[PDB]
Amino acid sequence: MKTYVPKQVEPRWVLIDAEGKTLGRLATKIATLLRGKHRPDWTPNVAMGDFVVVVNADKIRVTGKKLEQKIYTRYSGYPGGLKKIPLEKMLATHPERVLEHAVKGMLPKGPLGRRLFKRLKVYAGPDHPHQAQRPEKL
Amino acid sequence: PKGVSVEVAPGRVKVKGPKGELEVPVSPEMRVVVEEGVVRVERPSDERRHKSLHGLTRTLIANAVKGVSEGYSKELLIKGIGYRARLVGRALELTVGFSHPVVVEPPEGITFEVPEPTRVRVSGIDKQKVGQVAANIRAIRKPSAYHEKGIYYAGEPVR
Amino acid sequence: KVRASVKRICDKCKVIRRHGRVYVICENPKHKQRQ
Amino acid sequence: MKGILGVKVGMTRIFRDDRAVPVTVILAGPCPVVQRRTPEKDGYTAVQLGFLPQNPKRVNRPLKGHFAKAGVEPVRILREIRDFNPEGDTVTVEIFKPGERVDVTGTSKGRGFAGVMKRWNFAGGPDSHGAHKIHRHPGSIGNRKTPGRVYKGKKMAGHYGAERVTVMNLEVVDVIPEENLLLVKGAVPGPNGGLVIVRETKKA
RNA sequence: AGGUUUGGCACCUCGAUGUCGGCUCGUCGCAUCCUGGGGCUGAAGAAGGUCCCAAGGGUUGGGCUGUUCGCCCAUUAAAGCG
RNA sequence: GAAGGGAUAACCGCUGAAAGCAUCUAAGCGGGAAGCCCGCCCCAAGAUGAGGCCUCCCACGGCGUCAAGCCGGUAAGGACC
C-alpha cells in the first residue's frame, strides 16, 4: 500500500508578459500554469499553483483578422438582447479582459477553476503595482 | 534627380527635395535602398503575393521623387449660372445652384489656386492629399445633368 | 444591379470586382450589374 | 453645470405681453458649498451643496465642519452637482437669468402598489358582455411550451410612484433673488415641499 | 431555399396535450408596407419602374359577416407578410 | 424623440500593382444610413473582483494548547417604544 500527498505549500507567484504572442497560444500556458499542472506535487482537489501575473496587456497579436471578426456575445441581458462586442472594442475600451476570457475557458468549471481564475492577475501595463515578489518567467 | 535626398529606414522611406520630405512606408521586405546614382527595388519569390506587393512600391517611392521635384497639378471646370469660385485666402467658396454657397476648407500641405471664376486647380505635394481633394471638389456638382452644369477635371464628358 | 449568367454586355462593361460583390459594369448604367 | 438644491413650493401663473403662463415656484436657497472633489482627490469633480439651515447639534460624528460654511450642517442634507465648481461660498440663486433652460429633478409622488393599467395604462377588459371578473387584469402574460416562461421584463402590477424623475428644458421664467425664489414651467415632479435640484438644460 | 398552405407517415401523448374566432398582453423573423441610405433607368423636372443596404420606430377608425380572409366607407407616410 | 463624437452597410471615390496599359484593393487612404457604439433618462458595489471620498469613536478589564472558538462594561453611533 502507498500514498502520495503534499502538505501546505507556499504560493510561488510569477510575473509574465509576451505581448508578442497570440493570446490563447499564451493563455493556455498561463492556465496550464495556474493550476499546478507543471509542479510534480499534483492534487486536482487541492488548489495549489502559480499566482500568475501578466503585465503589458494587449499588444497581443491575434493571427488572421478579428476586425469585428472576433465577436464577444458573452453578454445576454434578459429581455430581448444578446449584446455582442468585437475585439477592437475591448482593446480600446478597457482591454485586459481579452486575455482574461481566454484564460477562463481554459480553467476547469468548478468552484476551484473559479478559485483558480481568482489567481490570474492581468493588467494593461507594463506596470503591475501589486507585487512584492515578481518571478518573471520566460 | 539631384534635388532629391532619398533616405532609407527599416520599412519606410523619407524622401527629401526642393519641395519637402515625405513618408513612404513600405513592406519590411526587400531592404531595397538606394543603389547607384538612382533608386532601385527588388523582391524575393515570384509569388503573385510579392510581384503585386513589388512594383507597387517601384511606383510608390518614384512618386515621392517626382513629388518633391515640383509635383502639383489638379485642374477643374464649371459651366452654367452662378457656377464659379472666389478664392478666400488659402481656401475657396464656389457656388453652384445650392441656395447656400460652398466654403471648401483649406487642407494643409495643399494649396488652392483660383485662376479664374471658371477653371480651377489644386496644387500640392502628394496625391493622397491631392486626389482625396478631388472629392473635396467634384463632390459639389455632378456631371450628366444632360451636361453643362457641374464641375469637371480636364477629361471629356459623355452625352 | 444583377445576379446571374452574364457574358459582359459591352466591353465597356468591365467586371468591377470589389469588397465581395462581383459587380461588372461599363460606362453605361444600362450595361451595369452587381452579383 | 450650475447646481442648486431647492424645494418645490407650489405653482400659479403669470402673464407676458398677453398670454398666461404655468409657473411652478421652486425655492432654492443659498447653498453653503461644503465640499469639493478634484480628480486628484475623489476622481469625479463636483460640489457638495447644503440646504435647510437650522439644526440643534443633531450633527453628531459627521460634524464635517472643516469648512466655514458649516453654519450648522443643513440637515436638508448635501448632494453633489456632478460637474460644478463655483466660488466656494454659498451658491447664490442669481445663477439663473430669465430665459435659461434647466433640468429639474425630484421625487415622483408615491402612488403605492399601483395596478397594471395605471402603472402601464393597460387595456383591462370589457365592463360588460364577456366575463365580469377579469375587468382590470393584465390578460395573458406569455405563450405555451416555448419559451415556457415570462419574459424578464413583462410589465406587471407593482410599486409605482415615489421615484427619481427628471423633466427637462424647463424655461426659467422669473427669479426673485429678493425672497430667494425660482419660477418655471409647472412640470416639476414631487409634492410641494420637495427636495428638487435645478440644473441646466442639455438642449446644448 | 424556407417550413406559412394543402397533403403523406402514424414516433410522444386516449389512468385526457380543452381544437375556430374575438379580447388582453405581447415578443421574435426579414423574405421591408411606411419612414433612412444607394445603383441602374427606355431617369430632362415632378412621378414612377427595378434591384441593393437597412426593421430604430410606425403600421388608423368604421359597414357586412362567428368569421380568419375578403369586399366596400373615410382617411393615411403606410394602412407589411410570418 | 434631439444636438454633437466615433465606427460601418449598400454604395460613391483618391493612390496604385500584380498585368509596362487600367481598377476603389491586393498593401494604403477618404467620404456613406431612421441603422451600430457613446451620448439623454432610470436601476445599480451580493460589481465576494463586494469600489472611492469626507468626518467621527477609541485600548484587554480576565480565562486553555492563546487572536477568542469566552465573557464583563464601553465609545462614536444604533435599535426599542
Q: Which string of DSSP letters, residue by residue, matches A42-70? A: --TTT------EE-S-S--B-SS--SSSS
Question: What is the three-class DSSP state of A26?
Answer: helix
- Residue A102: CB atoms within 10 A of its CB come to 21
Which residue, among B148, B90, B98, B82, has the nearest Cα to B114 in the 3D structure? B90
Find where cell 466655514 sits. D68
C-alpha cell at B33: 535602398
Q: Measured between alpha carbons, how far is B133 from B113 in angstroms, rounded to an integer?
A: 13
Q: Measured between alpha carbons, how far is A79 from D154 in angstroms, rounded to an integer?
A: 9
Please report which helix (H) or strand (E) contains residue B16, including its range: strand B13-16
- Residue D29: CB atoms within 10 A of its CB come to 21
Asked whether the beta carbons of C26 and C9 are under 8 A apart, the reply is yes
Asked whether the beta carbons of C26 and C10 are under 8 A apart, the reply is yes
Where are any strands of DSSP class E within chain D? 5-16, 19-26, 101-102, 105-107, 113-114, 158-159, 164-166, 170-171, 182-183, 194-197
Q: Measured between alpha carbons, how far is A24 from A16 in angstroms, rounded to an integer?
A: 14
Please report which helix (H) or strand (E) contains residue B121, including its range: strand B120-124
Exposure string over B65-100, b if 16+ CB within 10 A, otherwise e: bebbeebeebebbbbeeebbbeeeeeebebbbeeee
A/D interface, count of CB pairs below 8 Å: 6
Question: What is the three-class DSSP state of B142?
Answer: coil
Q: Measured between alpha carbons, how far is D98 from A1 in angstroms, rounded to an integer?
A: 93
Q: Measured between alpha carbons, how far is C25 from C34 in angstroms, rounded to an integer?
A: 8
Q: Measured between alpha carbons, how far is B121 from A113 in angstroms, rounded to an integer?
A: 68
Chains near C, with 3+ CB pairs < 8 A? none
Query: Which nucleotide shows the minimum CA-to-C1' distance to residue B130?
Result: F14
Q: Which chain F positions come under 7 Å from a protein C-beta?
A: 2-3, 9-11, 13-19, 23-31, 37, 40-43, 48-49, 52-57, 76-78
For this entry, resolution in Å reads 6.4
Which residue, among D142, D137, D143, D140, has the nearest Cα to D122 in the 3D structure? D137
| C window 1-35: Cβ near strand E (< 7 A) | 1, 28-32, 34
The CA–CA distances, whole Å, from D28 to D5, D49, D50, D108 equal 6, 11, 11, 19
Find where cell 515570384 sits. B46
Chain D partners of A78 at a C-beta cutoff of 8 Å? 152-153
Q: Measured between alpha carbons, how far is B82 from D164 in angstroms, rounded to an integer?
A: 57
- Residue D83: CB atoms within 10 A of its CB come to 12
Chains D and B touch (3+ CB pairs under 8 A): no
Q: Does A79 touch chain D (CB under 8 A)?
A: yes
Bin B97: left if φ > 0, else alpha if -120 < ψ < 50, else beta.
left
Asked whether the beta carbons of B102 and B86 are under 8 A apart, the reply is no
Find where cell 412640470 sits. D187
End-to-end CA distance of chain C: 7
Dihedrals phi, psi of D81, to nearest 5 degrees: -150, 70
Question: What is the three-class DSSP state of A22?
Answer: strand
Q: Measured between alpha carbons, how far is A39 from A52 in angstroms, rounded to an integer?
A: 14
Which residue, among B76, B71, B72, has the nearest Cα to B92 in the 3D structure? B76
Asked whether the beta carbons of D106 and D191 are under 8 A apart, the reply is no
- Chain D nearest-CA distance from A79, in A, is 5
Measured between CA atoms, the residue of chain D closest to residue A81 is D152
| B window 93-132: Cβ near strand F (< 7 A) | 127-128, 130-132
Q: Which amino acid makes up residue D192?
A: N
Question: What is the three-class DSSP state of B21?
Answer: coil
Q: Measured between alpha carbons, how far is C14 from C17 in angstroms, rounded to an integer?
A: 9
Nucleic strand F within 7 A of Cβ D163: yes
* Experiment used for this model: cryo-EM
Q: Measured between alpha carbons, how far is D21 from D173 in angstroms, rounded to an integer?
A: 9
Asked whether the beta carbons of B131 and B153 are under 8 A apart, the reply is no
Q: Which amino acid makes up residue B129?
A: K
Q: Measured between alpha carbons, how far is D5 from D2 in angstroms, rounded to an integer?
A: 10
